[model samples]
Target: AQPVIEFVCEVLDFKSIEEQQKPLTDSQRVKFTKEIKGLKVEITHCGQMKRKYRVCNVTRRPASHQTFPLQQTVECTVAQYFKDRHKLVLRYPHLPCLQVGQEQKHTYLPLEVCNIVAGQ
Candidate 1:
């Protein structure tokens, strides 16, 4: 039989939990990518329901600058999209965003609102 680890219901908070929240460094970004790539994470910004997604890639730009195709060749920043759609304001918009889900899907989420699922 395999080792039985204790189950812990926990979620990681990247914003208020750490001092170094804004403007992630090159080495720090690499480290985060290596550790969390393919790991399961959940969105904290949404209420009541918990939506989970797999870590795909770490974006080079922050949420404030990161863009995705809106419609008809139009692009929209992640920060603005979040505020407009979810009515949520990002506190640490300078931090690098997490590209969750499939690479082709282009789903970008701010690191501040993403939490690592317990027992990953």
Candidate 2:
């Protein structure tokens, strides 16, 4: 008997933000989500930690515009949070984010900082 599998030779690539600035529409995102959801990715921006996460969803807004509560009375954009926390300025802050881990947890990350895990 053979093991049941959906993808044996997937490309496992991220949408390149270097060549274009256009954002994805709902229809495009539907297709994109199917390809990356549940895929494992590592945070390249985090120095020395080498943390990994499973992609859970995609955010509609770009990292520069997406804001979440940072403190009791502070709301910060994803772009600002990364700059302060990691001391790394995002190269493609206008690109959509990858919502990793549990959907409700709101762990949004920019594509520029993630590397697709190989052989998974």
Candidate 3:
């Protein structure tokens, strides 16, 4: 699977979940994929503690090249993909780590500001 991605971004109020309730900025999200592999999440990466960003739910794509792993094949997680393959690493690092499961989850939004919700 290629993987869908998400992260959270706050403007100033870095402490309030209500304020953090806002979705992750696109600028940050793209940067995130570059930072952590498997589209890292499940925590916040305050970003030098300036933009007030939080990331969680590091959900990855369905899996494109699913093959049985050999004893030394070294299974790759999302985070590992970016780190070893892309040579990218965490710059902010709040580190919540998104959960992969069979349920609904919420985290970041695309190009949307916080305090806003989709159709009520």
Best by TM-score: 2
Q: Could you tell me which 10 consecutive residues in candidate 3 have the lowest summed lDDT?
A: 109-118
**Model 1 TM-score, 2 decimals:** 0.78
| TM of each candidate vs. truth | 0.78, 0.79, 0.25
Order the candidates by TM-score, highest first — what do you get?
2, 1, 3
Instruction: List the candidate 3 regions with Cα displacement exceeding 4 Å.
Output: 1-7, 15-79, 100-120
In model 2, the Cα lDDT at residue 99 comes to: 93
RMSD of each: 6.7, 6.6, 14.3
Question: What's the number of clashes in each of the models?
Answer: 0, 0, 17
Q: Candidate 2: worst 10 consecutive residues by lDDT?
A: 1-10
Q: Which ten residues in a row have the lowest lDDT in candidate 1?
A: 1-10
Q: Write the number of the candidate with greater TM-score, choosing between 1 and 3.
A: 1
lDDT of each: 0.71, 0.71, 0.32
* Candidate 3 lDDT, 42-69, residue by residue in tens: 2223333323223333333312222223
Candidate achieving higher lDDT, 1 or 3 = 1
